[PDB]
Amino acid sequence: EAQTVISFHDGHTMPQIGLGVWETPPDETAEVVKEAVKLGYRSVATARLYKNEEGVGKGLEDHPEIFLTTKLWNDEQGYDSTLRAYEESARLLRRPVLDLYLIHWPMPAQGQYVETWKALVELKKSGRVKSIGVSNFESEHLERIMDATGVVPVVNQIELHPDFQQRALREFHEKHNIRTESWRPLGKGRVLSDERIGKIAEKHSRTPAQVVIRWHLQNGLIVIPKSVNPKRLAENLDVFGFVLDADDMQAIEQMDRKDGRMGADPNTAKF
């Protein structure tokens, strides 16, 4: 069955599934991309941090058909320094006008991140990026920037996966037309082997992962899972051949913990 897409308040539209490009090293980046596209992967997403925009922009030579996301790193923040940052990402990536552009972290102690959003609202008023948004923002932080500059980011990317469901923030999100991208959507693989998922993947003749990748799907979550082993790739991507029930859905909802965070607390994270 054909895939799905999620759309944005700014009227653009992004496939609800895509490929993560975390870690995967610069020279194999090139390779792994094409290999992936050939699977029917429609979106790609990397970040500046990983420094494989070059490998992506070669990898995606003569594949404009595909939704390309990238993230402005923390040492490039402010107004004039972000515009600069964008051109160059666009250069290494090679698609002067990109699909999605994300502010990697707020870094609120660094206080320089609202400056950073104007630079963004600019790039879209120019129409030099298609769709702008952020990564790892809170209530406090988004409110702060929607009041400062009157435009909501289309997407805020955040940590989330069965053991952490930021339902507070997905309440705030939903109430501002904001799309919510899952970061580390398998809780780093803790759930690969969780026993609630050893029944629900049996049930539907699938592996534990897909089960969950789908969870994200059936929550309206743009999800961007990363593998290299192409067996996994086309596995992750084959998540439309089925569907789940509320017996299922409200059974993976019990997996949420208050303490389920595993990464930087973006309020407190220092780099």
Ligand SMILES: NC(=O)C1=CN([C@@H]2O[C@H](COP(=O)(O)OP(=O)(O)OC[C@H]3O[C@@H](n4cnc5c(N)ncnc54)[C@H](OP(=O)(O)O)[C@@H]3O)[C@@H](O)[C@H]2O)C=CC1
């Ligand atoms: N500050 C922060 O916010 C934090 C960030 N991180 C970052 O997150 C990243 C960690 O990546 P990771 O946790 O591995 O990503 P995920 O949460 O996506 O973990 C899932 C892992 O499972 C594997 N996998 C993918 N598809 C399948 C499949 N079909 N069957 C079985 N296994 C599969 C993948 O590895 P494989 O390629 O082997 O398939 C993947 O690495 C790092 O960049 C790390 O620094 C970590 C902690 C905190």
